Amino acid sequence: ANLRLQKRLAADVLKCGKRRVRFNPAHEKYIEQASSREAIRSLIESKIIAKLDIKGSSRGRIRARHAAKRLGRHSGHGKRRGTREARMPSKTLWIQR
Amino acid sequence: TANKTLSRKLRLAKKTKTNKNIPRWVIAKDHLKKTWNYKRHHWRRSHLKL
Amino acid sequence: SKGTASFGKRHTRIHGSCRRCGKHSFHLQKHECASCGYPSAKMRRYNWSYKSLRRRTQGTGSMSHMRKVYRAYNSGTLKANARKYLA
RNA sequence: CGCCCGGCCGCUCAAAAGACCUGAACCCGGCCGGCGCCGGCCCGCCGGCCCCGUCUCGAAACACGGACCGAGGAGCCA
RNA sequence: GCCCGCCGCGGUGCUGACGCGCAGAUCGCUCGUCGGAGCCGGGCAUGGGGGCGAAAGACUCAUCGAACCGCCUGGUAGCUGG
RNA sequence: GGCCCCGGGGGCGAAGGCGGCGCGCAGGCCCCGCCGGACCGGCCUCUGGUGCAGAUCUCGGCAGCAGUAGCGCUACUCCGCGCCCCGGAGGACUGAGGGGGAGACGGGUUCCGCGGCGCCUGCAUCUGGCCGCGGGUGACUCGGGCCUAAGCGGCGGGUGAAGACCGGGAAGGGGCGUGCCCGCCCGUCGAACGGGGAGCCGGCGGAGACUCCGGCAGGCGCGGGCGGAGACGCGCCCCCCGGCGACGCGCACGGGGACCGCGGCGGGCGGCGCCCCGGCCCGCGAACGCCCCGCAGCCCCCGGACGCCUUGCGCGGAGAGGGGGGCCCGGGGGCGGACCGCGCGUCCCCGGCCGCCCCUGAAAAGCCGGGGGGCCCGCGCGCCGUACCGACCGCACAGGACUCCGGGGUCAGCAGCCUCUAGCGCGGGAGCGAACGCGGCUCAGGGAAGUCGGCAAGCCGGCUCCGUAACCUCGGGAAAAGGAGUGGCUCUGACGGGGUCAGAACUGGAACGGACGCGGGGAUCCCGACUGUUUACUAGAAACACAGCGU
RNA sequence: CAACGAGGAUCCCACUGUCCCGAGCCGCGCCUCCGCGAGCCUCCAGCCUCGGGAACGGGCGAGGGCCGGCCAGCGGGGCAAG
RNA sequence: GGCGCGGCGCCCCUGUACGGCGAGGGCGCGUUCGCCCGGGGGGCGCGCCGCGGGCGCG
Ligand SMILES: [K+]
Ligand SMILES: [K+]
Ligand SMILES: [K+]
Ligand SMILES: [K+]
Ligand SMILES: [K+]
Ligand SMILES: [K+]
Ligand SMILES: [K+]
Ligand SMILES: [K+]
Ligand SMILES: [K+]
Ligand SMILES: [K+]
Ligand SMILES: [K+]
Ligand SMILES: [K+]
Ligand SMILES: [K+]
Ligand SMILES: [K+]
Ligand SMILES: [K+]
Ligand SMILES: [K+]
Ligand SMILES: [K+]
Ligand SMILES: [K+]
Ligand SMILES: [K+]
Ligand SMILES: [K+]
Ligand SMILES: [K+]
Ligand SMILES: [K+]
Ligand SMILES: [K+]
Ligand SMILES: [K+]
Ligand SMILES: [K+]
Ligand SMILES: [K+]
Ligand SMILES: [K+]
Ligand SMILES: [K+]
Ligand SMILES: [K+]
Ligand SMILES: [K+]
Ligand SMILES: [K+]
Ligand SMILES: [K+]
Ligand SMILES: [K+]
Ligand SMILES: [K+]
Ligand SMILES: [K+]
Ligand SMILES: [K+]
Ligand SMILES: [K+]
Ligand SMILES: [K+]
Ligand SMILES: [K+]
Ligand SMILES: [K+]
Ligand SMILES: [K+]
Ligand SMILES: [K+]
Ligand SMILES: [K+]
Ligand SMILES: [K+]
Ligand SMILES: [K+]
Ligand SMILES: [K+]
Ligand SMILES: [K+]
Ligand SMILES: [K+]
Ligand SMILES: [K+]
Ligand SMILES: [K+]
Ligand SMILES: [K+]
Ligand SMILES: [K+]
Ligand SMILES: [K+]
Ligand SMILES: [K+]
Ligand SMILES: [K+]
Ligand SMILES: [K+]
Ligand SMILES: [Mg+2]
Ligand SMILES: [Mg+2]
Ligand SMILES: [Mg+2]
Ligand SMILES: [Mg+2]
Ligand SMILES: [Mg+2]
Ligand SMILES: [Mg+2]
Ligand SMILES: [Mg+2]
Ligand SMILES: [Mg+2]
Ligand SMILES: [Mg+2]
Ligand SMILES: [Mg+2]
Ligand SMILES: [Mg+2]
Ligand SMILES: [Mg+2]
Ligand SMILES: [Mg+2]
Ligand SMILES: [Mg+2]
Ligand SMILES: [Mg+2]
Ligand SMILES: [Mg+2]
Ligand SMILES: [Mg+2]
Ligand SMILES: [Mg+2]
Ligand SMILES: [Mg+2]
Ligand SMILES: [Mg+2]
Ligand SMILES: [Mg+2]
Ligand SMILES: [Mg+2]
Ligand SMILES: [Mg+2]
Ligand SMILES: [Mg+2]
Ligand SMILES: [Mg+2]
Ligand SMILES: [Mg+2]
Ligand SMILES: [Mg+2]
Ligand SMILES: [Mg+2]
Ligand SMILES: [Mg+2]
Ligand SMILES: [Mg+2]
Ligand SMILES: [Mg+2]
Ligand SMILES: [Mg+2]
Ligand SMILES: [Mg+2]
Ligand SMILES: [Mg+2]
Ligand SMILES: [Mg+2]
Ligand SMILES: [Mg+2]
Ligand SMILES: [Mg+2]
């Protein structure tokens, strides 16, 4: 009824954090009897224990805004915070030319 | 410290080993009523200067 | 900030264990004991503290050799052994 | 030993003396009675009564020390 | 030994909070400085009428117009208490 | 010290305790009842640490106050018998200078597994750094041992009443093999960040790993005279001359690695009222050995000059350019060990230059070269540290406490604000919605009349363009003062695949740095030239310092 | 004396709850409840007016008031505490 | 004082919902526009009705 040991041993076998290890709540009596990495490997086999994929951050809005920005959008004077020099240094332009 | 001389390790090792209760058969053998060993110490409130 | 905050800057050992007297009194930077005086050849003893004198002196330890010599003199055979030799 | 689910009852003992001899005061809980000192009367009326110790011409003082209780506590010796 | 500004280093005003504290000096906002006489860690040196001081009689382990510890010492009091 | 008439009172109940009569002017004494369970006295003579209400008395116990005052870090909820513990589902936070992952110092067993709630865990507990019982840290290659820094010891002796303190002027030791030869005189003290011979990948455990096991290597030891025109290429010992070890700061520019993105293609997911080849996850290759390739930079050969070349410079008759070569280069490739392209940046190291100083940026062990002279196969590698922690110091605690690694969006950005990975306490909860406080918000009309005093609060603020006075040590003043524009969408032009810069139409309460971040300004007088320093804990200044000047 | 200053002063523009003159709202404390649970202080006590008095009384002389027990608030007195 | 809970109507506040269909500077894409539409959402005020609303203590 205290499963701190199995949670720590499972994240070691699966190489993830303890925050993305999930037990099937049925079969909890099975998990309680496991004390070694070998008995934990059996449960990962019979699918009693699993790991979640990491959640990302969707880049669909980022990729659309960048697509619009190569068309000339979102880039007028109301959108600029740094000076012209900080945005495109005058020395970088001189050297290229 | 994780980097200690063998001489400090040995004196620390002895304070750990002698930090014990009176055995219960000793309490029956020597007919004692004081049962606490008052030379014990605990790491949170001690100042072993060793 | 000369009080509680200043005490949080302490992570040093001024004194360590003495090889002669065993106490937490050996100055690690001056290499001298503030209790027994080591590495001096004589022991540090002061008459302005007789309480410090009684804490570590003859008798506060085992007296292992001196005990045996006295009992041999008082009631054993040692006073006879001198007469054979001193003749 | 027994009975209920720690308690009760009771066992050892001259005695619980039961985590311990005796077990005072200050302070407190339960039952029962009643609504400060001195004096007269059997008894709640009438009469009298400022907080002690101290320094001081002078203290109830808006002068200082003192919540309460116990034990210790200061002219001896050469 | 330039200017705005982050961490860092400091400590202006609110005479704000707290003031039987979170704390025997702290917290919030505001503020000085930020390539330099800049800031930080370890080792080492200087010892009490002495040290050290961009100098405030400042600092020298919560102690400084003379540190701390034991002894001389039950120091002396024409003065307060009993 | 004595007496207490057959040798004083006592378990047939001593001393003490609690109540109650009596006697004495009083200090006090005597008796009775109950408690208690072993010792105690009246009279004469002797002796003293011999009598308490007080001293901010000392030590111990303890009342009212009073069930009172009180219990920073955004946050938990439902179900599982359910506790703040554990599981599942949801909702949030820390926000890569982390409430993340690890070391140094300090602590010392706090580490791990099983059990448990007496103490502690200021509420609870079935939780736990608490309590009981078992366990736990493996090295030729990592550090310590070695070297020396600033220092500190030692030194025939010297000095002082000594303790002790001070010190080169001393017949100062080695190689061997006898016997010759050579020789001026300390430290196996002082760094777990400096110097230093050599380690990488995969796997296994409840708690250890660059240490174990398997594999692949590396280091230090021990035993069985040629080629070239040239730059250059391919055993030892002593004396002397050298080298490596071995070194500051800086804006920039260049190269590599790692990270990070976009697109393809291969495998797997999610949700799906409409749309979706538009969302998410995974596609991995070390040390070491051999071959090739390496910009700058320095060198060789021919030959004899109005050029070569950098972002900047810089270079050449003391021999440029051009043609052909050599050496260095912490790197890359191919084969071993054993999925495919293209980009802007960020961090780290390296390169060649240039700038700066009345500042010029350690030493030694160890290892090597030169000149001169004399002459493949086996075995092994000892000693010590190694668990864990901000569990450390502040009497236990919003204080104090060195370093390393550092993703995405917005953006000038290591700022603010939101977030993937990882991690999840913070002396406890519920109800009500008074005064009053503490931290916040808004206010008609007026606008400092308030107050010692504009204290506090508010106005200003990003970026682009326009426009900027007095005075001045000519450098400044200066963001002086003041103005205007700024979103979304559809497009166009410029630069050699990449962002930026410029312009236009259309459109929306008459809006646009829409949150966040972010100067109010001006005219003067006094003091000190300026940056800097200070009363740790009531004084930051006009005080100290300073360059300059003078004695 | 240009430049510089968390240095001492006077004035103006702009700005505002500083003020005329205050009003409404948010969170957290307070408040009520379950659990937990202290400090300071205390001669004895705790209603006034006048007189006398160590010349400003809770108590003393004379008058006027007053069942007893408690809460949320508050700062006149207790010559309140330190 | 047999509560209230939850509805439907009225009346108010904001300012015309999502969607469907048909104008839009431009190059099937497109901010925005018009119409259904003083609409949709909301209510702590007013009016009338599905589940319900008279214990135990002195
Ligand atoms: K483009
Ligand atoms: K260790
Ligand atoms: K400790
Ligand atoms: K402090
Ligand atoms: K010493
Ligand atoms: K007095
Ligand atoms: K006096
Ligand atoms: K007098
Ligand atoms: K008196
Ligand atoms: K008086
Ligand atoms: K009084
Ligand atoms: K007096
Ligand atoms: K007084
Ligand atoms: K008094
Ligand atoms: K700062
Ligand atoms: K305030
Ligand atoms: K502070
Ligand atoms: K600056
Ligand atoms: K010193
Ligand atoms: K001194
Ligand atoms: K002294
Ligand atoms: K003393
Ligand atoms: K002395
Ligand atoms: K005197
Ligand atoms: K005196
Ligand atoms: K006194
Ligand atoms: K109280
Ligand atoms: K347990
Ligand atoms: K002498
Ligand atoms: K000397
Ligand atoms: K050293
Ligand atoms: K070091
Ligand atoms: K070292
Ligand atoms: K070096
Ligand atoms: K040579
Ligand atoms: K280890
Ligand atoms: K309330
Ligand atoms: K009030
Ligand atoms: K004014
Ligand atoms: K202000
Ligand atoms: K625009
Ligand atoms: K000054
Ligand atoms: K400066
Ligand atoms: K001050
Ligand atoms: K100051
Ligand atoms: K200042
Ligand atoms: K000063
Ligand atoms: K000037
Ligand atoms: K200044
Ligand atoms: K200054
Ligand atoms: K100033
Ligand atoms: K109000
Ligand atoms: K009077
Ligand atoms: K009076
Ligand atoms: K009085
Ligand atoms: K008064
Ligand atoms: Mg330029
Ligand atoms: Mg101090
Ligand atoms: Mg030191
Ligand atoms: Mg008893
Ligand atoms: Mg007097
Ligand atoms: Mg006095
Ligand atoms: Mg008093
Ligand atoms: Mg007494
Ligand atoms: Mg500066
Ligand atoms: Mg600045
Ligand atoms: Mg204040
Ligand atoms: Mg004295
Ligand atoms: Mg004295
Ligand atoms: Mg006596
Ligand atoms: Mg006495
Ligand atoms: Mg007394
Ligand atoms: Mg957040
Ligand atoms: Mg544990
Ligand atoms: Mg508790
Ligand atoms: Mg090594
Ligand atoms: Mg050494
Ligand atoms: Mg090193
Ligand atoms: Mg580990
Ligand atoms: Mg160096
Ligand atoms: Mg470790
Ligand atoms: Mg107004
Ligand atoms: Mg005025
Ligand atoms: Mg006025
Ligand atoms: Mg100045
Ligand atoms: Mg300054
Ligand atoms: Mg101060
Ligand atoms: Mg100050
Ligand atoms: Mg008003
Ligand atoms: Mg009074
Ligand atoms: Mg009276
Ligand atoms: Mg008052
Ligand atoms: Mg419409």
Side-chain angles (χ1 to χ4, degrees), chain A, chain B residues 1-23 25-50, chain C residues 1-82 85-87:
Chain A
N2 185 16
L3 301 182
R4 301 216 203 79
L5 176 66
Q6 293 81 328
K7 206 60 100 53
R8 174 179 80 77
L9 291 193
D12 187 294
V13 162
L14 301 164
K15 297 206 173 73
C16 66
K18 294 187 297 293
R19 70 203 299 273
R20 55 183 189 107
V21 165
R22 290 312 194 274
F23 293 162
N24 186 300
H27 301 117
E28 176 175 299
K29 69 134 307 197
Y30 275 110
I31 308 168
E32 197 188 355
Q33 320 283 322
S35 165
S36 63
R37 290 164 170 90
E38 208 56 51
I40 295 274
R41 290 184 182 103
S42 283
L43 299 173
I44 298 171
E45 164 69 14
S46 61
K47 311 196 66 43
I48 308 288
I49 297 179
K51 80 198 264 186
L52 294 172
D53 290 13
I54 73 170
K55 355 193 309 188
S57 184
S58 323
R59 296 185 67 93
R61 296 170 312 260
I62 290 165
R63 285 169 194 145
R65 191 198 190 259
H66 284 330
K69 202 165 164 55
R70 292 185 236 95
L71 274 238
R73 318 281 191 257
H74 322 298
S75 63
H77 282 130
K79 304 301 263 159
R80 307 171 191 180
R81 305 290 172 263
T83 67
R84 179 164 70 240
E85 168 77 14
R87 288 169 68 91
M88 189 59 52
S90 33
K91 194 162 161 106
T92 301
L93 292 174
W94 165 260
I95 296 177
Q96 287 181 22
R97 174 159 51 98
Chain B
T1 182
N3 307 283
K4 61 164 78 57
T5 68
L6 180 67
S7 285
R8 291 182 69 203
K9 187 173 166 188
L10 287 170
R11 293 196 68 173
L12 286 183
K14 186 204 183 186
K15 301 287 287 172
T16 296
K17 193 186 325 179
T18 67
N19 196 16
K20 291 185 157 64
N21 290 330
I22 317 189
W25 58 271
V26 168
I27 294 179
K29 179 180 93 63
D30 287 308
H31 281 81
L32 303 175
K33 196 250 154 88
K34 281 79 69 141
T35 56
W36 171 252
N37 176 26
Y38 54 72
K39 297 215 165 159
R40 300 201 66 182
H41 63 78
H42 190 70
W43 64 274
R44 252 200 285 93
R45 42 129 202 155
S46 64
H47 304 286
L48 272 49
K49 286 169 172 179
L50 276 310
Chain C
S1 297
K2 57 184 175 183
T4 299
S6 298
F7 282 105
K9 295 178 149 54
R10 283 180 174 204
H11 54 259
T12 309
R13 312 199 293 113
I14 311 306
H15 297 84
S17 272
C18 181
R19 77 161 76 182
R20 187 160 79 180
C21 73
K23 292 181 57 176
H24 175 256
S25 308
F26 192 71
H27 202 284
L28 304 174
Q29 195 171 338
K30 293 185 252 185
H31 310 301
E32 301 165 307
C33 186
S35 187
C36 68
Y38 184 81
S40 178
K42 52 184 178 164
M43 308 286 299
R44 181 177 167 286
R45 312 260 67 188
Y46 288 115
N47 293 312
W48 41 258
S49 187
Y50 62 70
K51 275 162 70 153
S52 158
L53 294 176
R54 47 153 99 132
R55 288 186 182 109
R56 180 180 60 233
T57 175
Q58 192 195 105
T60 66
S62 303
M63 295 273 287
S64 300
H65 176 81
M66 275 181 75
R67 259 173 35 211
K68 267 72 166 199
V69 173
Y70 280 48
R71 176 149 73 63
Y73 194 94
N74 291 18
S75 347
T77 74
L78 195 60
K79 289 196 87 175
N81 279 7
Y85 182 78
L86 277 310

